[PDB]
Design a binder for this molecule. Structure first.
Ligand SMILES: *C(=O)[C@@H](NC(=O)COc1ccccc1)[C@@H]1N[C@@H](C(=O)O)C(C)(C)S1
Length: 376
């Protein structure tokens, strides 16, 4: 029964909203529902999760959501293997560095382009020490290079340069499709939980977001800034044959030029992230994330989110209680470039198998730069 149970739960929820009925009224109707799920994508996601979590800690969990950027359709959805258990694709989770892309959106919207040079040295902000993993830096480098290398220090400085600071990062993320609320969280990306501003940790993905939100927001990027609400229901026909709903019969949230520049910055990242380029030379745009466990040196959540123009997939790996460092069976720390990228690549390759390779739209000038500056 498994992963399809969690899909069914989301379909039911959506039908309830669509028809404004309770579940008993729905169940007795005998509706014939066509979902958006693509079996080929779904099978690829399920296989990838099984493969990469095999032999790992039995407390390890994963979630995968794949969305069609053309229309918001949910093509693959793995929230867990228990139909009657917890849906990890709906859980509020810290995103870590995968959230940096929204700071880049915000920057580009203000005319700060990919070639903007930022210092990567360590700094302290609001009394919190900001550093990069293994003290990595670039001296001073552009914000496209700092995204690829995932420099915390550079992205903190970039956020502070924005008009609105962390609020501008929240605005961009919300505009991209990070939902404003979900169950658990009445006001997302809000320190006071009431709609007030986020604090500076937003750029390092310290707020809770769902895996579905990340897939959807990156879908907006994949669609050159056009947002479509995510949905699971394609068509509904009555038991006796009357069509009641058909999705086959968007909103420019982010400017095309901005979104296409963000894409350009993200293009090298699947490969940079321990060689997770998609099969058959297929281009992609991606971003990893890895959160800290407490104040320890170990990891808590690991992410890979990335897209082609035809599919946006978010993957999270963590543990069931979210209270233990995240490691492999051999003791190795799990980063975004590890198991989540293995799952992401396998899901993407599988879901897109048999389709021709797409190229991304050529970016036009934003902040004085069109695409990633060529290096010296
Ligand atoms: C974003 O996720 C960044 N993550 C970190 O800096 C992790 O920080 C700590 C983790 C454990 C203990 C102390 C600090 C950068 N992005 C990551 C990614 O997966 O893209 C990274 C590992 C490359 S660093």
């Amino acid at each position: 029964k498994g992963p399809n149970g969690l899909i069914e739960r989301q379909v039911t929820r959506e039908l309830l909203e669509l028809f404004n009925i309770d579940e008993q009224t729905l169940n007795t109707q005998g509706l014939v529902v066509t979902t958006t799920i693509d079996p080929q994508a779904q099978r690829a996601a399920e296989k990838a999760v099984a493969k990469y979590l095999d032999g790992q800690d039995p407390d390890m969990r994963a979630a995968v959501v794949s969305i069609d950027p053309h229309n918001g359709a949910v093509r693959a959805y793995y929230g867990g293997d228990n139909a009657n258990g917890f849906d990890f694709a709906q859980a509020g989770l810290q995103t870590g560095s995968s959230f940096k892309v929204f700071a880049l959106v915000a920057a580009l919207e203000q005319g700060i382009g990919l070639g903007y040079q930022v210092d990567s040295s360590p700094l302290t902000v609001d009394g919190i020490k900001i550093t990069n993993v293994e003290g990595e830096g670039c001296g001073t480098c552009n914000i496209a290079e700092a995204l690829k290398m995932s420099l915390n220090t550079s992205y903190y400085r970039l956020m502070l340069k924005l008009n609105g600071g962390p609020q501008a990062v929240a605005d961009a993320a919300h505009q991209a499709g990070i939902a404003s609320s979900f169950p658990g969280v009445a006001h997302t990306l809000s320190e006071d939980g009431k709609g007030g501003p986020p604090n500076n940790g937003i750029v390092l993905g310290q707020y809770q977001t769902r895996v579905i939100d990340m897939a959807s927001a990156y879908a907006t990027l994949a669609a050159s800034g056009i947002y479509h609400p995510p949905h699971f229901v394609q068509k509904v026909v009555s038991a006796n044959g009357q069509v009641l709903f058909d999705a086959s019969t968007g909103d420019q949230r982010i400017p095309k030029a901005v979104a296409d520049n963000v894409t350009a910055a993200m293009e090298p990242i699947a490969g940079y992230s321990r060689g997770h380029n998609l099969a058959g030379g297929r281009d992609s745009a991606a971003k990893t994330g890895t959160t800290q466990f407490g104040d320890t040196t170990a990891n808590k959540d690991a992410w890979m989110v990335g897209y082609t123009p035809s599919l946006s997939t978010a993957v999270w790996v963590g543990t069931v209680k979210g209270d233990e460092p995240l490691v492999t069976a051999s003791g190795a720390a799990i980063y975004g470039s590890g198991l989540p990228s293995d799952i992401w690549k396998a899901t993407m390759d599988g879901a897109l198998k048999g389709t021709s390779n797409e190229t991304f739209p050529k970016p036009t000038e934003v902040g004085g730069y069109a695409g990633v500056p060529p290096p010296p």
